[PDB]
């Protein structure tokens, strides 16, 4: 019937799988297992009619760079994820992920998704970043990159606390349907 295919990409350990499992099942994964590929599906009512939202979970690992794009055909919307407390992941949105998805799927919309926002005001995390003179990514900085890369929208969330989490998918859904 009606379907939306959403593919989620981004650096290793930015939180793609936690985002998906937390959203689709309201549980938080209890151990980190690197993803190769996983495929989830839920139903969402949109103006009172059911859509199947297919969520494709992909490897952040570079060794899956040649296999990953085999999952891309007929994608309706991408989530390009970076952790707001990992500057390297944010740089790779520009240097790796948006170039990759737009090469394969030039007409397909994507959202820039900042993850792990609960750690933005976490003293231990800030301390850890400050060791290497790093700083978290601010919303203003992310919005600027989203505009420059022609993302539909920048959204952010915490899979752990679920703050912003439903809104991420609401915006992905609307982007797929616009």
């Amino acid at each position: 019937m009606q379907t939306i295919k959403c593919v989620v990409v981004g650096d290793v350990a930015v939180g793609k799988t936690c985002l998906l499992i937390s959203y689709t099942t309201n549980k938080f994964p209890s151990e980190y297992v690197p993803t190769v590929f996983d495929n989830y599906a839920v139903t969402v009512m949109i103006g009172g009619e059911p859509y199947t939202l297919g969520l494709f979970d992909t490897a952040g690992q570079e060794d899956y760079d040649r296999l990953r794009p085999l999952s891309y055909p007929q994608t309706d919307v991408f989530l390009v994820c970076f952790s707001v407390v990992s500057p390297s992941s944010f740089e790779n949105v520009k240097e790796k992920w948006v170039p990759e998805i737009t090469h394969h799927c030039p007409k397909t919309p994507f959202l820039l998704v900042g993850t792990q926002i609960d750690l933005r005001d976490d003293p231990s995390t800030i301390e850890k970043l400050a060791k290497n003179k790093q700083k978290p990514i601010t919303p203003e900085t992310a919005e600027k990159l989203a505009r420059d890369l022609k993302a539909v929208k920048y959204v952010e969330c915490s899979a752990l606390t679920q703050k912003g989490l439903k809104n991420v998918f609401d915006e992905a859904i609307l982007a797929a349907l616009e």
């Binding site: 590929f37 495929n39 839920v42 139903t43 009512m45 939202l53």
Partner: peptide
């Protein structure tokens, strides 16, 4: 209220996967 989207409802039929990726799936699925 026209762009309101419900909470997700579990256990829908997963969308088709390219057959060659089938073996690379799971266990998280």
């Amino acid at each position: 209220s026209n762009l309101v989207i419900s909470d997700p409802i579990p256990g829908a039929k997963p969308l088709p996967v390219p057959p060659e990726l089938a073996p690379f799936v799971g266990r998280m699925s």
